[PDB]
Amino acid sequence: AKAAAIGIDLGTTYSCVGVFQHGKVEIIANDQGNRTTPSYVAFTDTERLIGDAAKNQVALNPQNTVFDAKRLIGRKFGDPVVQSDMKHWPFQVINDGDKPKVQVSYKGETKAFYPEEISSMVLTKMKEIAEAYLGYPVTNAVITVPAYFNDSQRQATKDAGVIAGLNVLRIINEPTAAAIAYGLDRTGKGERNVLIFDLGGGTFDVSILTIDDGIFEVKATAGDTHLGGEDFDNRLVNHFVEEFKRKHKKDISQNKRAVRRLRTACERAKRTLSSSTQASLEIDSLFEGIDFYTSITRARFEELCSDLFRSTLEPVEKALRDAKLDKAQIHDLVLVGGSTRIPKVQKLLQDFFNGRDLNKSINPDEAVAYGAAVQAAILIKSTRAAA
Ligand SMILES: Nc1ncnc2c1ncn2[C@@H]1O[C@H](CO)[C@@H](O)[C@H]1O
Ligand SMILES: [Mg+2]
């Protein structure tokens, strides 16, 4: 009779929704079969597109396709971070009372939205994905945020849930949700130190938590808000642009279609390289009707991104220093984020911890949502105590 509650990982680049029922979690696929959904919203003269449909039409509608709203949420327009990020976005960000708003063309009008309004559209889609699986309306949810988010950012995320028609049970930290997915808070009495290594599409976060009798304390947070999978895609694209120049004596960089098609093929070859030692790249008529059929080895990809992968250890060292803990004092190392599938990244972290095994038995893309779904199921319990 009681509807299930959902756990939502409201990500910078992608979001994910889960439900915990009968001792098991289901990470829910959307109608296109994807277990993760782009945190994108596109506006046209006739439609508001959310998720895959928005991301899939970004190439020709860059001014009216919004993404990265999580980088603006709960911040001031005057913030240096906001002014820097704006230089990289094709959509307009406006100033309304020292608060940023995204401005687009939508259904015949110029319209401006607060970041919480864009995130409420992403949350609306995640709610619908869950309702398609459950077969009934969903209202209760736990939403996750980065551990470094302040009160303004947490409140703006709750407001996004409220606008989406969701009752927000709690806002919980992303690394806490990942620890809950592994049941790390169920180890009973005694302090447990957990390091969460979160490398995603566009961000990198390291968090150290101490858990005692199910109570969490964030001991340190470090990372780089501008390091992730997209930076590795960028390195591959540069390598291929150079290769094309070498073979055909043409620079393909100015044709946006060629660069986009190359970037899309690069990202897929990158995924293959996590499972195979080689990946072929085949593109028909990339530039001036020339087919670009080539290959790349895992060793070459690792060389291309080597400095980026190595740089992930600096925040790990910093977090350990800030938490006042030695490497040997960390009980569990947990991998989160799609980019942690890269073998070289796992090797570097393992070597840093002198050969320690890494927790990766839960899909890295889904661990945060999984933990949020477990917490949501706990929070809606309303049993009266037996005599
Ligand atoms: N198997 C994989 N190997 C490497 N990167 C991956 C893999 N799966 C997903 N990613 C990356 O994780 C990020 C979040 O989806 C993206 O940058 C994506 O390219
Ligand atoms: Mg994330």
Ligand 1 in reach of 74 Cβ (< 6 A): no
According to the annotation, is 202 in a ligand binding site? yes
Residues 122, 39 contacting (CB under 8 angstroms): yes
Tell me how crowded residue 379 is: count the other CB atoms within 10 A of its CB. 15
Query: Distance between CA 85 and CA 83 in Å, rounded?
Result: 6
| Residue nearest to ligand 1 atom 9, measured at CA | 338
Tell me how crowded residue 107 is: count the other CB atoms within 10 A of its CB. 11
CATH of domain 1-66+122-186+360-380: 3.30.420.40
Q: Which ligand is the nearest neighbour of the Cα of 229?
A: 1
User: What is the four-CA torsion angle of 263, 66, 127, 215, rounded to 10 degrees?
Assistant: 80
Catalytic residue, chosen from 52, 68, 174, 365, is 174
According to the annotation, is 262 in a ligand binding site? no
Query: Distance between CA 303 and CA 324 in Å, rounded?
Result: 33
Tell me how crowded residue 251 is: count the other CB atoms within 10 A of its CB. 12
Query: Distance between CA 154 and CA 173 in Å, rounded?
Result: 10
| 272 token code pair | 């293959």
Cβ neighbours of residue 85 under 8 Å, at least 6 residues apart?
68, 71, 72
Method: X-ray
C-alpha 151 – ligand 1 centre gap (Å) = 31
Nearest of 271, 237, 272, 264 to residue 251 by alpha carbon: 237
Please compute Rg for the chain using Cα positions.
22
Q: Which ligand is the nearest neighbour of the Cα of 178?
A: 2
Catalytic residue check, 249: no
Task: Name the CATH superfamily, with its identifier, for domain 228-311.
Answer: ATPase, substrate binding domain, subdomain 4 (3.90.640.10)
Ligand 1, closest atom to CA 273?
3
Cβ neighbours of residue 204 under 8 Å, at least 6 residues apart?
198, 223, 224, 225, 227, 228, 312, 315, 337
Cβ neighbours of residue 351 under 8 Å, at least 6 residues apart?
none
| Residue nearest to ligand 1 atom 2, measured at CA | 271
Q: Which ligand is the nearest neighbour of the Cα of 200?
A: 1
Q: List Cβ<8 Å contacts ≥24 apart for 98-101.
A: 100/72, 100/75, 100/76
| 165 token code pair | 């028609």
Query: Distance between CA 62 and CA 55 in Å, rounded?
Result: 10
CA distances from 46 to 107, 109, 115 (A): 6, 11, 22
Q: Which residue has the tokens 């993404």?
A: 67
Query: Distance between CA 262 and CA 294 in Å, rounded?
Result: 12
Ligand 1 in reach of 267 Cβ (< 6 A): yes
Ligand 1 in reach of 300 Cβ (< 6 A): no
Q: In the 3-class helix/strand/coil scheme, how is the chain assigned residue by residue?
A: CCCCCEEEECCCCEEEEEEEECCEEEECCCCCCCCCEECCEEECCCCEEECHHHHCCCCCCHHHEECCHHHCCCCCCCCHHHHHHHCCCCCEEEECCCCEEEEEEECCEEEEECHHHHHHHHHHHHHHHHHHHHCCCCCEEEEEECCCCCHHHHHHHHHHHHHCCCEEEEEEEHHHHHHHHCCHHHCCCCCEEEEEEEECCCCEEEEEEEEECCEEEEEEEEEECCCCHHHHHHHHHHHHHHHHHHHHCCCCCCCHHHHHHHHHHHHHHHHHCCCCCEEEEEEEEEECCEEEEEEEEHHHHHHHHHHHHHHCHHHHHHHHHHHCCCHHHCCEEEEECHHHHCHHHHHHHHHHCCCCCCECCCCCCCHHHHHHHHHHHHHCCCCCCCC
Catalytic residue check, 174: yes
Domains 1-66+122-186+360-380 and 187-227+312-359 share a fold: yes
According to the annotation, is 2 in a ligand binding site? no
Residues 28, 34 contacting (CB under 8 angstroms): no
C-alpha 149 – ligand 2 centre gap (Å) = 13
Resolution for the entry shown, Å: 1.6
Catalytic residue, chosen from 52, 55, 70, 85, is 70
Cβ neighbours of residue 60 under 8 Å, at least 6 residues apart?
none
| 381 token code pair | 């319990």
Q: Which residue has the tokens 């340190």?
A: 220
Residues 194, 325 contacting (CB under 8 angstroms): no
Half-sphere exposure of 331 (CA within 13 A, CB side): 14
C-alpha 12 – ligand 2 centre gap (Å) = 6
CATH of domain 187-227+312-359: 3.30.420.40
Ligand 1 in reach of 202 Cβ (< 6 A): no
| 65 token code pair | 């396709």
Query: Distance between CA 301 and CA 272 in Å, rounded?
Result: 11
> Angle at the Cα of 120 (from 33 to 204), degrees rounded to 5?
70
C-alpha 141 – ligand 1 centre gap (Å) = 27
| 74 token code pair | 């709960």
Ligand 1, closest atom to CA 338?
12
Query: Distance between CA 284 and CA 290 in Å, rounded?
Result: 7
| 362 token code pair | 């839960």
| 194 token code pair | 């957990």
Residues 13, 368 contacting (CB under 8 angstroms): no
| Residue 144 CB-density burial (10 A; 0-12 exposed, 13-18 middle, 19+ buried) | buried
Residues 164, 124 contacting (CB under 8 angstroms): yes
Query: Distance between CA 306 and CA 286 in Å, rounded?
Result: 27
The residue ranges of every structural domain in the chain are 1-66+122-186+360-380, 67-121, 187-227+312-359, 228-311
Ligand 1 in reach of 229 Cβ (< 6 A): yes
Q: Which residue has the tokens 């790390």?
A: 184
C-alpha 100 – ligand 1 centre gap (Å) = 30
Cβ neighbours of residue 154 under 8 Å, at least 6 residues apart?
74, 145, 171
CATH number for 67-121: choose from 3.30.1050.10, 3.30.30.30, 3.40.80.10, 3.40.50.300: 3.30.30.30
Amino acid at the residue 157? T
Catalytic residue check, 9: yes
Query: Distance between CA 206 and CA 196 in Å, rounded?
Result: 6
Ligand 1, closest atom to CA 274?
3
| 148 token code pair | 């470094």
Catalytic residue check, 191: no
| 31 token code pair | 């109608």
Q: What are phi and psi of 2, to 5 degrees?
A: -90, 125
Q: CB within 5 A of ion ligand 2: which residues?
A: 11, 200
Checking phi first, is residue 115 left (phi over 0); if not, alpha (psi -120 to 50) or beta? alpha
Query: Distance between CA 204 and CA 141 in Å, rounded?
Result: 25
